[PDB]
Amino acid sequence: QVAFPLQYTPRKFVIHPESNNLIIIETDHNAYTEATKAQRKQQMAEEMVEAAGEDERELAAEMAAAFLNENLPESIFGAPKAGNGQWASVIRVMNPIQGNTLDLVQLEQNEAAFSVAVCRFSNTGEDWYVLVGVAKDLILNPRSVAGGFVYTYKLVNNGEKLEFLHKTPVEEVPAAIAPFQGRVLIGVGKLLRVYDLGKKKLLRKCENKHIANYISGIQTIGHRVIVSDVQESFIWVRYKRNENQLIIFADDTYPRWVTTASLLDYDTVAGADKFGNICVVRLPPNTNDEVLWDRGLLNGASQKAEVIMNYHVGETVLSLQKT
Amino acid sequence: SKYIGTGHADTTKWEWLVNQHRDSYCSYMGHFDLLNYFAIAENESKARVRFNLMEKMLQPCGPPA
Amino acid sequence: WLYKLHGLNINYNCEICGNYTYRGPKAFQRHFAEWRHAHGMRCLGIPNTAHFANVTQIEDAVSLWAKLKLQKASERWQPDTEEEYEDSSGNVVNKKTY
Amino acid sequence: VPVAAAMCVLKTGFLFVASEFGNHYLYQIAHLGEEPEFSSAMPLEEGDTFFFQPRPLKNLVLVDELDSLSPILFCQIADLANEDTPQLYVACGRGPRSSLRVLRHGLE
Amino acid sequence: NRFTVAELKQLVARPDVVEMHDVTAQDPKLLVHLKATRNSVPVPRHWCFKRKYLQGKRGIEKPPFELPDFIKRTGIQEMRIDYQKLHDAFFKWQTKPKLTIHGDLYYEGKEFEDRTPWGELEPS
Amino acid sequence: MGKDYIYAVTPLLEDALMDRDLVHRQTASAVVQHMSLGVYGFGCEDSLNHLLNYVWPNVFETSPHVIQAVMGALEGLRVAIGPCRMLQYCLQGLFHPARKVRDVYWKIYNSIYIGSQDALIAHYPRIYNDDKNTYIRYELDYIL
Amino acid sequence: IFCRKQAGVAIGRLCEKCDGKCVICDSYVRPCTLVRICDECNYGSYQGRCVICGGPGVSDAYYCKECTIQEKDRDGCPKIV
RNA sequence: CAGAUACUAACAC
RNA sequence: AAGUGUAGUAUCUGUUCUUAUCAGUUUAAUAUCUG
Ligand SMILES: [Zn+2]
Ligand SMILES: [Zn+2]
Ligand SMILES: [Zn+2]
C-alpha cells in the first residue's frame, strides 16, 4: 500500500471518468474548519494578552506571538475537538497515481458533506458536474438538523478544478446522490427526488414520499432505482418517463440496517448492514415493475423481494463491489 | 421470569423499551465493529464511546411514567 | 342462554346508519361494510373504506375523513405546483407559469 | 502518540501501541522521563488545573509501524494506473490520520 | 379514561389499522403503532371467537390427501421395487409446491376462500 | 438429510395443520420442530415460513400436549427461520387488549428473547419518542 | 423440576434404564454435548447417581444434538429433583 | 356436573 | 384372552336460568358474581 494523507474522515469518493481523478468528500463531527481554527486561535491570543494589566503584558504578548506561530501537526497531536454538533468538511480532487491535491474546497463551519456524485446532465451534454450533499448544523444524538444543501460545481480543466456553480437548499440531509438518465436522483431524508440542473438551483422534476425512514443510499439500472432505507432495507422504485412518476413496486420482508449496496444483476442486490451481515435479495420471477383502497402487503409494497443469501461476516461492511 | 429481559402481560411500553436500550448498549459494547462505527461517526475515542454508553445504561429512556 | 351468548342484551347505535340499532357485537361489526352504512357514506360524500369501520358518529366520520383527505394529498405528488421550472435567467416558476 | 486501544511495555524497553484506528507502532523507550512533574500534594485552587506543553517525541523513538487499514470507509477496485490489474482504492483512517491508500496485489 | 374509537382514529397515522377493541388496551397508541409496522403479522382472527380453532370445520366431506405429482408418477399409489425411479422421483423430479409468503396466516375459511441472473450455476 | 425431503412432506404437514383433530395438529407441530432443527443452515426457509403460517394459528390452543408441541415447533423455527421472523409474528399480540393474547405472546417472546437476545437488537421495530420519554435508538441511525 | 444451578466440573451420569436418553427431552437420538452438574448434585451420597432418576449411574449423560443447537445445555444443572 | 366412548405422553409397571 | 396404573385432552349423552332501570365487582367485549 501506498498512503495519501487526508485532513478529515473520508466519507465517500467517486472517480471522474475522463481523467481518473478522485473527488473525495471528507467530514468530521466534533471538528473545526481551518477558518474557524484560525479565528479561535486569534481570539485565544487576544484574550491571553488582555489577561495581563502590568508590564507582564510584554511577556503575555511574547507568549501570544509564540502561540500564534506554534503549529503542532494534527496527525501527531490530534485535531482539536470542537463541541457537539460542530462539523468540518472538505471536497478534495486528488490524482490517484501520486496523491497530489489538484483542488481543495473547504465548506463552511457546521456544514458536513454526506454524499457526492459526478455526472453529465442531458440539458448541457458535455460538461461534468460534481454535486455534493451537505447537512447544516446536524446534531447526532438526539437527531436534529437545520436542513441541508446540494452544492453544484462544474469540474473543469480536464477534471482538475471545481468551479462553484450554485448552492441549492433542501429540508433534510441529502444523504444519497445518484446520476440517473441524464438528471440526478437525490435522497433528501425520507424523500426521493429527481433533480434537473437549471441555472440558479437544481430543479425538482419528480418526487416520491413513501420511503419509510431516512434514505441511506441509491443505486440504479435502466428505469429501476434501488433505495437503501436506514432500517427498512431495500425498496425497488421504477421511474416512469411519460407519467413523470416514481412508483414503489417491491420491498424486503426484513428490517436491515443497510450500510452499503451492490447491484449484482437487473433483479438482484447485495446488501451489507451495521450488524456485520451480508445478504443477497432478489426479485422473484414475474415481478411486475410496470405499475385509500390500496393497502399493499404487511404495511409494505404489494410484491416482495426474496432473501437468497444471508451471512454474518463478523465485521461491519461499508463497501461491496462486483469485480 | 428469572431471566432479566423477559416480559409478561403487564409489561409497559417504558419497561420494554428500557430493555431494548440496555440490551442495545450491551450489544454495542461487545460488537467491536459496531463500536468502531459509532466512534468514527461521532469523531470520538472508543474509550469515551464506551463510557458514554455505560452512562446511558442508568436511565436510557428518561424517567418511568 | 343463546340470547346472552350472542350478546343480544347489548344494543349499539350508528348515526351514519340513520340511528339503526343492530343489537349485536357481530351484527354491528359486519354492518360497516354493508348497504345502510354505505348509503350514509354516500349521503355524507365519504368513501366506505376500512378507515371508517367502527366509526358511528357523523361529526367524527366527517372530521376523520377531512384528516385522511389532507394526509393523502400531502402524501401524493402534485407536478402542477411541485415541479420546478426556470422562466429565464434562473427565475424559478411553477408548471402552470411555465 | 496516536490514541491507543492498548499500550504494552515490553521488558526489553519497547512500548507497543495498538492504535484505536490506523497503523500500530513499536517505540523504543529511550528514556524513562526540565518537564514539570504534577502531584496530588500540590495546592490547587477551585476549578483550576495543572497545565503542560505538548511537544515532539522525547522519551520514545519510533522503530516499527504496522500498516493497518482500519477503518475502511469507502473502497473502489479500478485500474486507474493503466497496469492491466486493478488497484483497490481505499479511503481509510479517521480524523487527521485519514488517508487514501492504493492497494496492489504483490510484494513491495 | 380510555380514548373513544373515534378519538384514537384521529390520533394515529393509520386509522384503518384501528379496531374496536384497541381502545381497551393498556397502551392503545403503542398497539396501533406496532400493528402499522412493516412486515409485522396480525394476531390470529379467532382469538375472540367462542368456538375453538378449526372446530367449526365439520359436516363437509373432503377427498383424501393429493400426492405430489413426482410421487404420484412413481406409481406407488397403484402398488398399494423400481428403486432407481424411486430415487429419481426425489432427486430429479421433485418440484417445489406453492409455498405461502411470510405473514399470510391460515384460518377456517382460508382453504375454501442484460437480464441474465448473476452467479448462476453452469448447466450439467 | 431432511433438506432432500422437506418439500415432499410440506403439503402433508400443511394438510395435518389444517385438520380439525388436535392430535394431527399436535403431531404435525412435532414434525415441524424436528425438521426445522435438522435443516438449520441449509436454505429451506421458504418451506418453514409457509409451515409457520399453519402452526402459528395454534398458539391459542389450551390442550397441554398440543400447546407444548406448538411451543416446541416455534423454538425449532426460531433457529431455522431466525429470531427476526419469530419477533415479527409476536409484535402485534404483545400489547393486544386481551390478556389471553398477551399471556401467550409474552411466553413466545420470552422464549425468543432467552434464545436470541443479541440477534433481536437488529430486529426491534422503531418506537417513536414520547413527550417525556426518548425511545429512538439514535446511534443505529448514524450514517458513515 | 430441574436444579438449574450453575453447572460445575462434575459430569452427569445415567443408570442402565435411562441410558441413551437426553436429560432434557428423552430423545434416544444423537447424544452430543456431555452433561455437567452442580457440585451439590455430585456431593457425598449423590456421587455417580443418575441425572434423570437418581439410580446407580453407569454411563455419561448427554444433551442431544437438538438440545445443543437450541443452547438448552446452557440452562444449568439438569438433575431432576 | 355425572356417565359412556375415543385419544395423547418412544408415560410407567 | 397382550393386562393394569399415573398425568392430561377430545367427543355424543342427560342439565345449560326473560330483567325492571341503574350502580359495583369483573372482562378485550359480553357473560358471571353482589346491591
Ligand atoms: Zn352505520
Ligand atoms: Zn435412571
Ligand atoms: Zn434433547
* HEC secondary structure over chain A: CEEEECCCCEEEEEECCCCCCEEEEEEEECECCHHHHHHHHHHHHHHHHHCCCCCHHHHHHHHHHHHHHCCCCHHHHCCCECCCCCEEEEEEEECCCCCCEEEEEECCCCEEEEEEEEECCCCCCCCEEEEEEEEECCECCCCECCCEEEEEEEEECCCCEEEEEEEEEECCCEEEEEEECCEEEEEECCEEEEEECCCCCCEEEEEECCCCCCEEEEEEECCEEEEEECCECEEEEEEECCCCEEEEEEECCCCECEEEEEEEECCEEEEEECCCEEEEEECCCCCCCCCCCCCCECCECCCECEEEEEEECCCCCCCCCCC
CB contact D20 to B (< 8 Å): yes
H-run or E-run covering D64: strand D60-66
Distance CA(F135)–CA(B14), nearest Å, equals 9
Ligand 2 (single-atom ion) residues, CB below 5 Å:
G 15, 18, 50, 52-53, 55
Contact A230 F121 (CB under 8 A): no
Resolution, given in Å to one decimal, reads 2.1
In this complex, the residue of A6, A15, A31 whose CB is nearest that of residue D93 is A6
DSSP G35: P
CB contact A124 to C (< 8 Å): no
To the nearest whole angstrom, how far is the Cα of E20 from the nearest Cα of chain C? 6
- Residue E101 buriedness (CB in 10 A; 0-12 / 13-18 / 19+): middle
Scanning every residue of chain E, which has its alpha carbon at the shortest distance from the alpha carbon of B17? E30
Number of the ligand closest to the Cα of G17: 2
Please note each residue after which chain C is broken, C-to-N distance over 2.5 A, or write none: none
Residues with Cβ within 8 Å of E66's Cβ and at least 6 positions away in sequence, in order, are F11
**Boundaries of every domain in chain B:** 1-65
Number of the ligand closest to the Cα of F72: 3
A97 CB neighbour count, 10 Å cutoff:
13
CB contact A241 to C (< 8 Å): no
CB contact E96 to A (< 8 Å): no
What is the CA E51 to C1' I9 distance in angstroms? 17
Question: Which residue in F127, A136, F104 sits closest to E40, CA to CA?
Answer: F127
Show residues of chain A in contact with F144, CB under 8 Å: 11, 259, 318
> Which residues of C1-98 form beta strands (DSSP E)?
13-14, 20-21, 85-86, 92-93
Distance CA(D82)–CA(D102), nearest Å, equals 14
Distance A171 CA to ligand 1 centre (A): 43
Distance CA(G10)–CA(G48), nearest Å, equals 9
To the nearest whole angstrom, how far is the Cα of F144 from the nearest Cα of chain E? 25
Any binding-site annotation on G32?
no
In this complex, the residue of F122, F134, F138 whose CB is nearest that of residue A140 is F138
Number of the ligand closest to the Cα of G16: 2
Answer for the pair A291, A240: CB distance below 8 angstroms, yes or no.
no
To probe the interface with E, which of B12, B13, B15, B17 has the most E CB atoms within 10 Å?
B13
The one-letter code for the residue type at A171 is E
Q: What are φ and ψ of residue G24, in 5° steps? A: -80, -30
Question: Which residue in C33, C67, C34 sits closest to C50, CA to CA?
Answer: C33
- Method of determination? cryo-EM
To the nearest whole angstrom, how far is the Cα of G61 from the nearest Cα of chain F? 21
Distance E14 CA to ligand 1 centre (A): 21
Question: Which residue in D5, D22, D6 sits closest to A75, CA to CA?
Answer: D22
Distance F46 CA to ligand 3 centre (A): 26
Distance B16 CA to ligand 2 centre (A): 42
